[PDB]
């Protein structure tokens, strides 16, 4: 309904259509109740009114923000933080769109609605799935709802960008995303975090390696699918460590075997 999206049947309220006044709320956008305890939490914080204020100021300006609100906090609105298994982080949402005007951005990472082009990060992901026997034919689409439902928490480390402009709302959503990740690693237990690229790695330093399992490699962008990534370690005593390349890791074949080794209903990836 909100994740099985078809761009040919894409009829969602705009920001101004969902916020007729420039003042922006976030209580509205969050549906699934299993989040309020975190959400109410971040309202006690101080960056939160300034955050809605920045967003409003963007609509005052008047930006073409994507993703559209009724898909912002999407993965949250369909994954309760309890029936979650894997946390995959995207850096910055898809900035492009289509001649139809539909944004690639469906409020979650690496996923695009149906009948929409498949970017090459996602395609290199499919290449991997095929390489490690997790899929036979790479699908014609990039709707990753069947992954989200099964418990794959795919989000962008910056929930909004302005259409056609890339990496614009970092220092706005940092304070939100950091608290989200801290909430996850602290309150909940035996999650699996996946670090694709340097930025998601930086975000996975905030995680408790005593509790959770962390897969780490380079990013699925064509610039890096074949390149190692040299960064730091996870633990308290860091060493200079080189993590493998996206095409040299069984990213999805480690998730399932860990979840089984913790007696958890695995994740059927193929489509």
């Amino acid at each position: 309904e909100y994740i099985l999206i078809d761009a040919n049947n894409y009829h969602f309220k705009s920001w101004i259509e969902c916020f007729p006044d420039c003042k922006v709320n976030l209580k509205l956008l969050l549906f699934r109740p299993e989040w309020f305890d975190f959400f109410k939490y971040v309202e006690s914080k101080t960056y939160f009114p300034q955050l809605e204020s920045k967003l409003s100021s963007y609509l005052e300006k008047r930006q073409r923000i994507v993703p559209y609100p009724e898909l912002l906090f999407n993965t949250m609105n369909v994954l309760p933080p309890g029936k979650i298994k894997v946390v995959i982080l995207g850096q910055d949402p898809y900035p492009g769109s289509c001649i139809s005007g539909v944004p690639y951005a469906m409020g979650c990472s690496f996923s695009v609605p149906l009948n929409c082009p498949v970017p090459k990060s996602l395609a290199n992901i499919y290449t991997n799935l095929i390489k490690f026997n997790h899929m036979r034919k790479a699908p014609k689409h990039g709707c990753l709802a069947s992954w989200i439902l099964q418990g794959t928490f795919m989000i962008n480390s910056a929930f909004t960008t302005v259409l056609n402009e890339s990496g614009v709302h970092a220092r706005t959503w940092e304070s939100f995303t950091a608290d989200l990740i801290d909430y996850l690693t602290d309150n909940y237990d035996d999650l699996i975090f996946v670090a694709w690229g340097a930025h998601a790695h930086k975000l996975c330093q905030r995680v408790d390696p005593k509790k959770h399992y962390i897969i780490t490699s380079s990013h699925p962008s064509p610039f890096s699918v074949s390149n190692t990534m040299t960064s730091m370690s996870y633990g308290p005593n860091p060493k200079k460590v080189t993590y493998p390349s996206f095409n040299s890791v069984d990213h999805f074949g480690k998730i399932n075997e860990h979840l089984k080794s913790r007696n958890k209903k695995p994740i059927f990836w193929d489509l």
Binding site: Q91, D92, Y94, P95, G96, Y104, P117, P119, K120, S121, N164, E165, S166, G167, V168, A170, G197, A198, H199, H219, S221, P222, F223, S224, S226, N227, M229, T230
Partner: protein
């Protein structure tokens, strides 16, 4: 302006599918020359020549261009500095 640099430089009329902000040391291993900032790598695709085009700019809001990488099917990539 990003869609226009690539046309001026290559004649290819293309749009940015995605982008990632990578770090100087992380670029230096692929380009050979180290940038003086973070590098947004903007990605586009050409199905006419079946090849990945990717522009290396400074981080927002400046977007100052730094390089252009064009990578074929087999994965070797021509590098033009800017």
């Amino acid at each position: 302006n990003l869609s226009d640099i690539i046309e001026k430089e290559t004649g290819k009329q293309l749009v940015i599918q995605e982008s990632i902000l990578m770090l100087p040391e992380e670029v230096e291993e692929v380009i050979g020359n180290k940038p003086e900032s973070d590098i947004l790598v903007h990605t586009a695709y050409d199905e006419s020549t079946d090849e990945n085009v990717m522009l290396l700019t400074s981080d927002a809001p400046e977007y100052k261009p730094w390089a252009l990488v064009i990578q074929d099917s087999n994965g070797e990539n021509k590098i033009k500095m800017l």
